[PDB]
Structure 1
Amino acid sequence: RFLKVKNWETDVVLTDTLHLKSTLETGCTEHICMGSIMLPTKDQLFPLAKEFLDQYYSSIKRFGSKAHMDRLEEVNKEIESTSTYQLKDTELIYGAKHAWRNASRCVGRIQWSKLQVFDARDCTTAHGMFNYICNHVKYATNKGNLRSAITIFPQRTDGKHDFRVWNSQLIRYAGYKQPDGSTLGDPANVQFTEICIQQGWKAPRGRFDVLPLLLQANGNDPELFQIPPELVLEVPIRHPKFDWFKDLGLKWYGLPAVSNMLLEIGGLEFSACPFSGWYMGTEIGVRDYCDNSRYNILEEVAKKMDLDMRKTSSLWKDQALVEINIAVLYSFQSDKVTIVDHHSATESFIKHMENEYRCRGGCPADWVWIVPPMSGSITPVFHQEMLNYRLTPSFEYQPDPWNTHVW
């Protein structure tokens, strides 16, 4: 019950005791593993607060101290009357950093304690939200020297006043159904690009059209906002060997800033909390160019490489995928925009695992998601046994707003 995990490349063994703090469920049972499934009141709220506040005050080495019990009774009394409660700034920051720290699917968590937290809990309007997001974006980009950030809009109250950023990421390209069959722009975002038009967006109908922001504050009909272009840093994609690679007319944006998840701290629910860091190369090149429901430039790259595309066993897809990913990293590094290759970041994660087992007794991890989408076996996380379990504070999934909004 004090589980162990083994790295089979190095024989390192770590003993996991952190998992016995786990609260939520995984979806798995004694009889069935779901490790690869994508998505599984006043009386409930107070224990959730006690638990969070207990771990908060131990983290600062004041468990059982005067300040601890007073803060507990303070929160205790506010739940009684107000039915909820508000986090002190210090807890807000702790909670945001530990939701990233507990993000069992995130490979970049070695940076978790350097997060920049922007308290936007005083926001009241979509224009307000837009101001906060533009500030987040500018701070995060930092002229290419990217910095981790999260901006936290007001907590849920009764589900009727939800703050929601309707974009899945703050910065994403547009996707348009072409009359003939295929897709122009980016096929992931075709339905959202519809909604923006459905809401009043003048789509330029190019390939790399930065989508507008669709901001929803206090539960009202959301509003369209154009991010100032000078805040959207983009990297034109070129290959350090193949001159013809520029001709494909490819670029990506520098700032990955995920905006559709829900942040849960001490039982409180922050449905608007866009957070950002920086890209691993494969997130753009393997996934955001080469997945069959994405750009499928794989064929053109290999065509332009005059590779034998007549049978899968020439591995021409793999060979193109490598080149594309070499190009994505070359371009970002050439323009001094932060990016991490998948060898770099998996080795960091292993180091971070080491540190978590050493000074925390464990580290929840979702092997299925930590292993990069190419070259998995030659990265050091492949041979790393991991234990997956759900800790609080956390980032959670939430329904898309456009299935729920009382319009």
Structure 2
Amino acid sequence: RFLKVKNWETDVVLTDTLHLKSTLETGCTEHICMGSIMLPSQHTRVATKDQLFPLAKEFLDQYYSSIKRFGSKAHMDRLEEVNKEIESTSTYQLKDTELIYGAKHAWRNASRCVGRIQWSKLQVFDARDCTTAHGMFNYICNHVKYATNKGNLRSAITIFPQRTDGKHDFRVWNSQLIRYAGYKQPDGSTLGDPANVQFTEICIQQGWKAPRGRFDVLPLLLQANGNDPELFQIPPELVLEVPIRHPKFDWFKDLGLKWYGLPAVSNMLLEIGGLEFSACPFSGWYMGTEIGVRDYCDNSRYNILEEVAKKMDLDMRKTSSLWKDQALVEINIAVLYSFQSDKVTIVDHHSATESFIKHMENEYRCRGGCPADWVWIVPPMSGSITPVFHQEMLNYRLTPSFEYQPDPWNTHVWK
């Protein structure tokens, strides 16, 4: 009831008791492990008033135990106060401090996130007074500007009104605030990002005039209080982009690649004390491999391993020449170099995985554990020359938490 995790590169052993406070379920059983299912039936997100107070009580107990005032009068009065409001309203409203705490701890508990060493330096923007899609756009624009900070990126989250009935949900229909468009071609192939081909057509369905090229920043589709979503263009001066060059290969600029500085996930759901925030865009900075390995080299993404290998002049006939591996390393040397020469914050997969082990140590010391998803923590190249490959990790689900949720267009009762 006090599990141990070993690092087989350093013989370091850590004792996890934090998993005892775990509540949600993982998808695994005594006779099956689903640790490589991407969106397990559990990791996806309707509440009643009866279920709400245990969740509220549980959360308020964490928060007051945090500010070193656990079970005191201000706690018991806040317990009764929320209890009473869940009678009156069959819901309740978080204090600003309770919001900041929950948001920071949703990140802290995100077991697939290798960047959590920074979990306590998160900037929380309360957009719970928003009422309209235009309001959302304005709030989202201030988020991009603040988080980008002229290349010196800063962690931030903007929290729109919580779900109430279910049919009055605030949703950002984009999967990220800033993503490039993808257009299928009249011959089958794909221009821009193949990930977004459906979403790009939904934007054109709602009136977007597409410049139909490579790296066309998509407009924002914003749904407010359950109403139909509306298109908004982020002022280009707010979209900071890095053109990708190599520090040895002068032909690498002629590849004409670029990526945006700001990674900002907008399709997830923030859960705090049983309350559900359907729109909560959050942003940090990139680990290089997200761009150079996954975005640029996934077969169903930009898929440039073909063209980079050519210009390098590689033995592309045999699978075992490792021409793919070889072009993969250069591509990530270029992403890192380009972002660094422009003073745009980025982290290499070696530095970020070392910081995660450091972070893991702090969480096992001053918290008793650190939920972690090995399948997701290990970077998508050079696995075992990073220290997380050699580190056992217990995965378990704690609240507050970020959760996946269905796309709005598979569930929105239109008009």
TM range (shorter): over 0.9
**C-alpha displacement at 1:364, in angstroms?**
0.2
Distance 1:144 1:273 in 2: 22
Q: Does 1:16 align with 2:16?
A: yes
The size of the alignment, in residue pairs, is: 407
**C-alpha displacement at 1:39, in angstroms?**
1.0
Deviation by residue 1:173-213 (Cα, 9 ceiling, x = unmatched): 00000011210011000000010001110000010000000
Q: Does 1:88 align with 2:95?
A: yes
Distance 2:302 2:89 in 1: 50
**C-alpha displacement at 1:139, in angstroms?**
0.1
Distance 2:73 2:24 in 1: 30
Distance 1:296 1:356 in 2: 38
Distance 1:99 1:201 in 2: 34
Distance 2:303 2:139 in 1: 35
**C-alpha displacement at 1:235, in angstroms?**
0.1
Distance 1:99 1:247 in 2: 42
SS at match of 1:113: coil
**C-alpha displacement at 1:343, in angstroms?**
0.1
Deviation by residue 1:288-324 (Cα, 9 ceiling, x = unmatched): 0101001111111000000000011000000000000
Q: How do residues 279-294 of structure 1 correspond to structure 2 at under 5 angstroms?
A: 279-294=286-301
Equivalent residue for 2:373, pick from 340, 355, 366: 366
SS at match of 1:5: strand
Distance 1:398 1:181 in 2: 30
Distance 2:214 2:204 in 1: 16
1:102 matched residue in structure 2: 109
Distance 1:251 1:58 in 2: 46
**C-alpha displacement at 1:159, in angstroms?**
0.5
SS at match of 2:139: helix
SS at match of 2:279: coil
Distance 2:411 2:282 in 1: 23
Equivalent residue for 1:61, pick from 68, 74, 84: 68
1:345 matched residue in structure 2: 352
Distance 1:29 1:293 in 2: 32
Deviation by residue 1:77-126 (Cα, 9 ceiling, x = unmatched): 00001100000000000000000000000000000000000000000000
**C-alpha displacement at 1:37, in angstroms?**
0.2
2:392 matched residue in structure 1: 385
**Structure 1: gaps of 5 or more residues:** none
Q: Does 1:250 align with 2:272?
A: no
Equivalent residue for 1:111, pick from 93, 108, 118: 118
Distance 1:131 1:246 in 2: 35
**C-alpha displacement at 1:276, in angstroms?**
0.1
SS at match of 1:86: coil
Distance 1:116 1:383 in 2: 33
Deviation by residue 1:242-280 (Cα, 9 ceiling, x = unmatched): 000000111000000000000000000000000000000
Choose 37-46 or 208-217, whichever is displaced more.
37-46
Deviation by residue 1:320-373 (Cα, 9 ceiling, x = unmatched): 000000000000000000000000000000000000000000000000000000
Distance 1:33 1:353 in 2: 23
Distance 2:148 2:383 in 1: 29
Could you list the structure 1 runs, at least 4 aligned residues long, displaced by more than 2 angstroms after superposition: none
SS at match of 1:114: coil
Deviation by residue 1:216-254 (Cα, 9 ceiling, x = unmatched): 000001000000000000000000000000001110000
**Structure 2: gaps of 5 or more residues:** 41-47
**C-alpha displacement at 1:286, in angstroms?**
0.1
Distance 2:405 2:301 in 1: 23
Distance 2:39 2:177 in 1: 22
Paired-residue identity, %: 100
* TM-score normalised by length of structure 1: 1.00
* TM-score normalised by length of structure 2: 0.98
Distance 2:118 2:373 in 1: 18
**C-alpha displacement at 1:64, in angstroms?**
1.2
Distance 1:38 1:52 in 2: 27
SS at match of 1:98: helix
Distance 2:281 2:186 in 1: 34
**C-alpha displacement at 1:42, in angstroms?**
1.0
Distance 2:313 2:303 in 1: 16
